[PDB]
Enzyme design. Structure first.
Site, PDB file in Angstrom:
ATOM      1  N   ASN A  44       0.817  -1.217   0.000  1.00  0.00           N
ATOM      2  CA  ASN A  44       0.000   0.000   0.000  1.00  0.00           C
ATOM      3  C   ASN A  44       0.847   1.261   0.000  1.00  0.00           C
ATOM      4  O   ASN A  44       1.942   1.268   0.560  1.00  0.00           O
ATOM      5  CB  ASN A  44      -0.917   0.003   1.225  1.00  0.00           C
ATOM      6  CG  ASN A  44      -2.107   0.925   1.064  1.00  0.00           C
ATOM      7  OD1 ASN A  44      -2.679   1.054  -0.025  1.00  0.00           O
ATOM      8  ND2 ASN A  44      -2.502   1.567   2.159  1.00  0.00           N
ATOM      9  N   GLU A  71      -7.395  -5.047   9.067  1.00  0.00           N
ATOM     10  CA  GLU A  71      -6.346  -4.225   9.647  1.00  0.00           C
ATOM     11  C   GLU A  71      -6.466  -4.078  11.160  1.00  0.00           C
ATOM     12  O   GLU A  71      -7.328  -3.341  11.644  1.00  0.00           O
ATOM     13  CB  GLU A  71      -6.476  -2.816   9.128  1.00  0.00           C
ATOM     14  CG  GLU A  71      -5.912  -2.534   7.783  1.00  0.00           C
ATOM     15  CD  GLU A  71      -5.971  -1.050   7.561  1.00  0.00           C
ATOM     16  OE1 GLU A  71      -6.911  -0.593   6.878  1.00  0.00           O
ATOM     17  OE2 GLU A  71      -5.115  -0.342   8.135  1.00  0.00           O
ATOM     18  N   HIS A  81      -9.026   1.888   3.894  1.00  0.00           N
ATOM     19  CA  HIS A  81      -7.843   1.757   4.726  1.00  0.00           C
ATOM     20  C   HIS A  81      -7.981   2.603   6.009  1.00  0.00           C
ATOM     21  O   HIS A  81      -8.647   3.648   6.019  1.00  0.00           O
ATOM     22  CB  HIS A  81      -6.582   2.123   3.943  1.00  0.00           C
ATOM     23  CG  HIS A  81      -5.339   1.535   4.525  1.00  0.00           C
ATOM     24  ND1 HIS A  81      -4.423   2.282   5.235  1.00  0.00           N
ATOM     25  CD2 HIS A  81      -4.883   0.260   4.546  1.00  0.00           C
ATOM     26  CE1 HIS A  81      -3.443   1.496   5.645  1.00  0.00           C
ATOM     27  NE2 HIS A  81      -3.702   0.263   5.245  1.00  0.00           N
TER      28      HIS A  81
END
Length: 225
Positions: A10, A151, A79
């Protein structure tokens, strides 16, 4: 068996030279996600056919249209900092995901809980509410184009990561379908290096990584078998 794994990430030019010269012995979709201004360069320079370029965070119909036109077929959405800093809600990320799928993208949709959320044992309610919002804007067939990245914002052990991933796959199985659940890549987006990548991937419900664009990404790839 596990679905095809994904390794996604990323100075930059040195990194792409490295990726280009890497032999990757097994089946694994690699993804280099980059910011808008570095996209063209990354696309000109990255030529390893096991890699695809992803956009990030684009949410505008015309923007998605141009990326697709430009030959970008992947995008990463939701994200952690998008949610906890920029203020993208569950529903904002959901709509971005739906928009991208409608425009022909493969979407890596990110979900994850904060430290305060993990500490208070609200991981499940938080994570599932995030993906539930995503599911609300998608049809069952859309899931062929979707990849979930978990995450651990709150940061983790293989057991913790396995437990998170497993709880995500159970919600998918029951709410969307066992067939969707079985094919879905759920990537581990927490901290990972060449030491624990291999360990993490061994977990029943880990299908890869959403990790940092860094020279050691190459070991993360090899960690996926």
């Amino acid at each position: 068996s596990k679905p095809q794994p994904i390794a996604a990430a990323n100075s930059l030019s040195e990194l792409i030279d490295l990726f280009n010269s890497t032999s990757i012995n097994h089946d694994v979709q690699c993804v280099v996600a980059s910011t808008f201004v570095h996209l063209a360069m990354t696309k000109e320079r990255l030529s390893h056919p096991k890699f695809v370029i992803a956009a990030q965070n684009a949410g505008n119909a015309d923007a998605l249209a141009s990326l697709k036109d430009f030959g970008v077929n992947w995008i990463v959405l939701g994200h952690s900092e998008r949610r906890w800093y920029y203020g993208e809600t569950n529903e904002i990320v959901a709509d971005k995901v739906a928009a991208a799928v409608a425009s022909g993208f493969m979407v890596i949709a990110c979900i994850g809980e904060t430290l305060q959320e993990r500490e208070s044992g609200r991981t499940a309610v938080v994570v599932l509410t995030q993906i539930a919002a995503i599911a609300k804007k998608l049809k069952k067939a859309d899931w062929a184009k979707v990849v979930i990245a978990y995450e651990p914002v709150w940061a983790a052990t293989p057991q913790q990561a396995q437990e998170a991933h497993a709880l995500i796959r159970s919600w998918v199985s029951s709410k969307i379908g066992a067939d969707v659940a079985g094919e879905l890549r759920i990537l581990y987006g927490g901290s990972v290096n060449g030491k624990n990548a291999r360990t993490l991937y061994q977990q029943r419900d880990v299908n890869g990584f959403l990790a940092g664009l860094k020279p050691e990404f190459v070991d993360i790839i090899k960690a996926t078998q």
